[PDB]
């Protein structure tokens, strides 16, 4: 296992009213990247908590209220496209042996180098680890078929990609969803995808579908440097 006990230090568990909502990825002490679809249905939420660290007594576990969630203007509930959310924590996490961010790579490096690494590491939820075989660009249009839908957003082939394969449902989809798809290169791990339609989700056999993070790098950096605004859930223009 790449990560100790299959628990990657950048993995985040998102809870609402103490119940599992989705997973996420820490990219620095204050920002977490997850999936927009995790916020499709909101009713009677008393909070939104990000949990990090060792979870499997008190040992190296940190929790943080999520101050704000930002989704792109191009995202449409129900459509498997532009599935990404940027979360700002009220207070920074403290980095430790069990809490470390995953690097958000530069766009060019991600497109020229990371996009060609054969396998990637996907983390989900207890923490789970899974090495997956990325589906080459040429086969993307075909692997995205099951995700396709009439009247949906254009260029799904550009903003989403596939990796690995799922044959049956597993009790782990909640935290799995919105979780990290990391790619290794010369000793360092980088964020390359966000679990959109993960393994262990649904009963039908399907490719794992992930949001291509390289298409959102500039957008994420723009959001992180912007002046703070009021509100807990906002739609920001994309690009």
């Amino acid at each position: 296992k790449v990560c100790p006990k299959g628990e990657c230090p950048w993995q985040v568990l998102l809870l609402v009213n103490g119940a599992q909502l989705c997973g996420g990825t820490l990219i620095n002490t204050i920002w977490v990247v997850s999936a927009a679809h995790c916020f499709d249905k909101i009713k009677n939420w008393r909070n939104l908590i990000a949990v990090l660290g060792e979870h499997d007594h008190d040992g190296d576990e940190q929790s943080r209220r999520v101050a704000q969630v930002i989704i792109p203007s191009t995202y449409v509930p129900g459509t498997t496209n532009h599935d990404i959310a940027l979360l700002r924590l009220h207070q920074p996490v403290v980095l430790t042996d069990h809490v470390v961010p995953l690097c958000l790579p530069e766009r060019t490096f991600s497109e020229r180098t990371l996009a060609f690494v054969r396998f990637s590491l996907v983390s989900g939820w207890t923490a789970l680890e899974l090495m997956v075989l990325n589906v080459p660009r040429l086969m993307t249009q075909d692997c995205l078929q099951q995700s396709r839908k009439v009247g949906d957003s254009p260029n799904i082939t550009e903003y989403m990609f596939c990796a690995g394969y799922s044959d049956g449902s597993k009790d782990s989809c909640k935290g799995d969803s919105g979780g990290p798809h990391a790619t290794h290169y010369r000793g360092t791990w980088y964020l390359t995808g966000i679990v959109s339609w993960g393994q262990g989700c649904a009963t039908v056999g399907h490719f794992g579908v992930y949001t291509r993070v390289s298409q959102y790098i500039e957008w994420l950096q723009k959001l992180m440097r912007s002046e703070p605004r009021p509100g807990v859930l906002l739609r920001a223009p994309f690009p």
Partner: peptide, 15 residues
């Protein structure tokens, strides 16, 4: 730039 606010607080959030 202009962002659309969907919820002010978690307690008053509906989506």
């Amino acid at each position: 730039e202009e962002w659309e606010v969907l919820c002010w607080t978690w307690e008053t959030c509906e989506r």
